[PDB]
Design a protein around this ligand. Structure first.
Ligand SMILES: Nc1ncnc2c1ncn2[C@@H]1O[C@H](COP(=O)(O)OP(=O)(O)O)[C@@H](O)[C@H]1O
Ligand SMILES: [Br-]
Ligand SMILES: [Mg+2]
Length: 405
C-alpha cells in the first residue's frame, strides 16, 4: 500500500469513521463458530477510538442473501455481541444500513460510539444484482455515515461492491488488517518456494473455477478438491455425480484448463473416491463411491475418501510452499470431516519440515480453529477468494479504490 493512504497516516481526531470490515463469519445452529474475522479488525477499530475518533461505524455483509432482507437467517446482530467482548467497548447494532433512520443514528454520535450496521447485502444495490440511480443513492447514504472511510475488509477486497469501491469521501484509507494481509502475501508470492502447490476446494464453484486459469501461470501443482472436483470429473471422466455441486459454465472450460495445466507442467490432483450422502444434512445416510463406480442418482459427494487423501498427501509431501483455500469436504459435519482433517494433518507435518503453508478463508480458517492448528501452519489468512485473486497477480478492487498518497 505504498501508493495508498493507510490508517497510520489518517487524521481521525474528532472525525466520524465509516469502516468496511469483513464480518462474514461462519455460523452453525445460529451461533458464530469462529470469530477470527471479527478479532482481525479490532486493531484498526481500537486505533480509531484511541486516536480520538468521534465514532466508528462498521459495515459488512454476511453470507449471500441476494439483495433481500433476511434477518432471520443472515443478521449481523450476533456479531455486535461478540465484538463487545473482543473490543472492551459496547457496540450499537442498527437494524438497517441506510438511509433516514440509520443516517440519524450516525450523524452526530456520542464521542467514542461504535455502531454496527445490518447486512449490506440485504440491499440489491450493494452487489448490486441478485439499477443505476438507486446504486448511486445507496452509496451516497453510506458516505453520510462518516467523515473519513477505512477499508479493513481484506476478505471482501476482491469484490467491487458499493461499500468497497463506492464510498465517496475525500479520504479513503486502508486499515491495518488490509496492510498486514497484503504485506504477508507480497513477500510470500514474490519468489515462492518450489514446488508451489495450490489446494482449491470448498463450495464456491461458479466463482472459483474462473480463477484457475490465471493460477496455472503461478503454481507447479494443484489439488482440485471438495465441491470443485465434481465439475471436472463429470467432464473429464464422464462420471455420474448425482446431486453433487456442479457448475454448468465452468464445465465448458475444464478441458481448456487441463490443456493449459499440461502446457505449463502443472500436476493436477483430483479425488478418486468419496463419502456420499443421500441429502445435504448433517444426519444424512452415507455411502462410499469411487470415480469408476460413480455416485448414485440423488446422492451427493460431501467428502473425499481414503485413496484421495493419500494422493493429496503425496502432493503436500512434494510441496515447498502451499496456499490452501476451500475444505475438501463438508468438515462442519463429522460424517464428512475426515478428508479435511487428514489434509490438515499433512499440512501441519509439512510446516514442521520447512514448508511455507498458507491457509485462508472464512470457512477454511475455521478448520484451523476446529483442529487447533492456527499456530502450526505459516499463515492463516482472513481472505479466501481474496487471497486466490492475489495469487493470480491482480490488484484487488477494494485496494484500488483507496485514496492515492
Ligand atoms: N463436496 C462438497 N460439497 C458441498 N460443500 C462442500 C464440499 N466440500 C466442501 N464444501 C464446503 O465448502 C465450504 C467452504 O467453501 P468456501 O466458502 O469457498 O471457502 P472459504 O470460506 O475458505 O473461502 C464449507 O462450508 C464446506 O462445507
Ligand atoms: Br460461487
Ligand atoms: Mg466461505
Amino acid at each position: 500500500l505504498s501508493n495508498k493512504l493507510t490508517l497510520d497516516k489518517l487524521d481521525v481526531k474528532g472525525k466520524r469513521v465509516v469502516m468496511r470490515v469483513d464480518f462474514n463469519v461462519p455460523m452453525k445452529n445460529n451461533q458464530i463458530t469462529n470469530n477470527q474475522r471479527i478479532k482481525a479488525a479490532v486493531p484498526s477499530i481500537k486505533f480509531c477510538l484511541d486516536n480520538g475518533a468521534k465514532s466508528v461505524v462498521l459495515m459488512s455483509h454476511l453470507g449471500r442473501p441476494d439483495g433481500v432482507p433476511m434477518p432471520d437467517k443472515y443478521s449481523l446482530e450476533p456479531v455486535a455481541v461478540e465484538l463487545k467482548s473482543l473490543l472492551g467497548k459496547d457496540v450499537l447494532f442498527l437494524k438497517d444500513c441506510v438511509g433516514p433512520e440509520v443516517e440519524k443514528a450516525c450523524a452526530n454520535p456520542a464521542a467514542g460510539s461504535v455502531i454496527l450496521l445490518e447486512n449490506l447485502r440485504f440491499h440489491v444495490e450493494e452487489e448490486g444484482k441478485g439499477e443505476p440511480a438507486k446504486i448511486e443513492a445507496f452509496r451516497a447514504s453510506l458516505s453520510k455515515l462518516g467523515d473519513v472511510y477505512v477499508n479493513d475488509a481484506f476478505g471482501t477486497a476482491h469484490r467491487a461492491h458499493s461499500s468497497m469501491v463506492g464510498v465517496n469521501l475525500p479520504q479513503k484509507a486502508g486499515g491495518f488488517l488490509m496492510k498486514k494481509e497484503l504485506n504477508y502475501f507480497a513477500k510470500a508470492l514474490e519468489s515462492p518456494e518450489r514446488p508451489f502447490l495450490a489446494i482449491l476446494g470448498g463450495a464456491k464453484v461458479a466463482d472459483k473455477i474462473q480463477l484457475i486459469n490465471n493460477m496455472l501461470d503461478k503454481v507447479n501443482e494443484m489439488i482440485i478438491g471438495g465441491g470443485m472436483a465434481f465439475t471436472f470429473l463429470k467432464v473429464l471422466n464422464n462420471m455420474e455425480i448425482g446431486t453433487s455441486l456442479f457448475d454448468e459454465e465452468g464445465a465448458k472450460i475444464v478441458k481448456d484448463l487441463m490443456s493449459k495445466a499440461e502446457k505449463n507442467g502443472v500436476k493436477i490432483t483430483l479425488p478418486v473416491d468419496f463419502v456420499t450422502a443421500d441429502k445435504f444434512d448433517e444426519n444424512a445416510k452415507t455411502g462410499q463411491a469411487t470415480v469408476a463406480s460413480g455416485i448414485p442418482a440423488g446422492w451427493m459427494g460431501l467428502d473425499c475418501g481414503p485413496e484421495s487423501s493419500k494422493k493429496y498427501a503425496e502432493a503436500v509431501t512434494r510441496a515447498k510452499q502451499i496456499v490452501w483455500n476451500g475444505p475438501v469436504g463438508v468438515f462442519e459435519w463429522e460424517a464428512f470431516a475426515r478428508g479435511t482433517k487428514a489434509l490438515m494433518d499433512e499440512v501441519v507435518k509439512a510446516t514442521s519440515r520447512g514448508c511455507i503453508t498458507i491457509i485462508g478463508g472464512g470457512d477454511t480458517a475455521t478448520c484451523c480453529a476446529k483442529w487447533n492448528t492456527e499456530d502450526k501452519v505459516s499463515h492463516v489468512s482472513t481472505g479466501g477468494g481474496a487471497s486466490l485473486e492475489l495469487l493470480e497477480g491482480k490488484v484487488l478492487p477494494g485496494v484500488d479504490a483507496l485514496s492515492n498518497i
